[PDB]
From a paper:
Type IV pili (T4P) are thin and flexible filaments found on the surface of a wide range of Gram-negative bacteria that undergo cycles of extension and retraction and participate in a variety of important functions related to lifestyle, defense and pathogenesis. T4P filaments are produced by the polymerization of pilin subunits in a process that depends on PilB, a hexameric ATPase associated with the bacterial inner membrane, while pilus retraction is powered by another hexameric ATPase, PilT. In Xanthomonas citri, two cytosolic proteins, PilZ and the c-di-GMP receptor FimX, are involved in the regulation of T4P biogenesis through interactions with PilB.
Author numbering:
A (entry chain B): 11 to 157
B (entry chain C): 9 to 117
Write the structure that this text describes.
């Protein structure tokens, strides 16, 4: 019976089949959304969880640490939205604003950003930690251009 | 363990180039699964020449099989900074003169 990210995480070798069964069983008992369970129980790493999230949802995954910060798009989104959702806007091309997310179901942030920005928003997977660290760095860079 | 990417023309080179990567990147379609951070060796052909340019790169992007959109499965490969990589970024940036500012979408962003 192991399916979902529970399945992928053992595909990718991130955690054993036994301890994946636990998480399905206990996250059902707790009525807790399974990937949050994995994340909060610290059974796998933020990047491990994101690699499964990607294969699981047909969504691309990016290492932002290789992203050239000078090209970011953080400034196109209010800081207020940046707080309400843990998301990391990455890059504009034409209409598109690519927005890094740690959870691919997290549709509320994409609609809020579309409305705010009147651009086409496509999501990209970035793992939860890189979103946190890289956002604050990119904000330091942008801040060096002025108030 | 040797990827090969050959780009017949400028459009194909545009689809593949990752300008938002530090030092530059190229998308390589492959069914093989790779982890972020893997060092990988690529043999790259650009459209101006039959010369095959070795590129020893780190994986920095993946697209899974059966990805949403018509997105193609593969990996983004960061050029190593330093002379060897900087040469390939440079060749790509001049070949793509006149498309650098295009809106048209790519294999990545």
């Amino acid at each position: 019976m192991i399916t979902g990210i529970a399945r992928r995480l053992v595909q990718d070798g991130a955690v054993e089949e036994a301890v994946a069964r636990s998480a399905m069983d206990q996250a059902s008992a707790a009525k807790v959304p399974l990937p949050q369970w994995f994340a909060e129980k610290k059974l796998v790493t933020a990047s491990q969880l994101a690699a499964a999230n990607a294969v699981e949802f047909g969504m691309p995954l990016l290492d932002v640490s290789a992203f050239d910060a000078s090209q970011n798009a953080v400034k196109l989104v209010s800081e207020e939205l940046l707080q309400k959702h843990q998301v990391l806007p990455l890059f504009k091309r034409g209409n598109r604003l690519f927005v890094g997310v740690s959870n691919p179901t997290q549709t509320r942030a994409l609609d809020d950003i579309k409305f705010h920005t009147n651009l086409v928003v496509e999501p990209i997977l970035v793992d939860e930690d890189q979103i946190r660290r890289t956002l604050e760095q990119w904000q330091a860079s942008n801040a060096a251009l002025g108030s | 363990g040797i990827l090969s990417l050959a780009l017949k023309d400028k459009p194909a080179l545009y689809s593949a180039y990752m300008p938002f990567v530090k030092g530059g990147g190229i998308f390589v379609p492959t069914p093989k699964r790779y982890m972020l951070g893997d060092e990988v060796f690529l043999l790259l052909t650009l459209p101006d020449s039959s010369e095959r340019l070795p590129v020893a790169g780190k994986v920095i992007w993946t697209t899974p099989a059966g990805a949403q959109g018509n997105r193609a499965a593969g990996i983004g490969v960061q050029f190593p900074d330093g002379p060897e990589g900087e040469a390939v970024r440079n060749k790509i940036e001049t070949l793509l003169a006149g498309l650098t500012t295009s809106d048209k979408p790519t294999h990545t962003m």
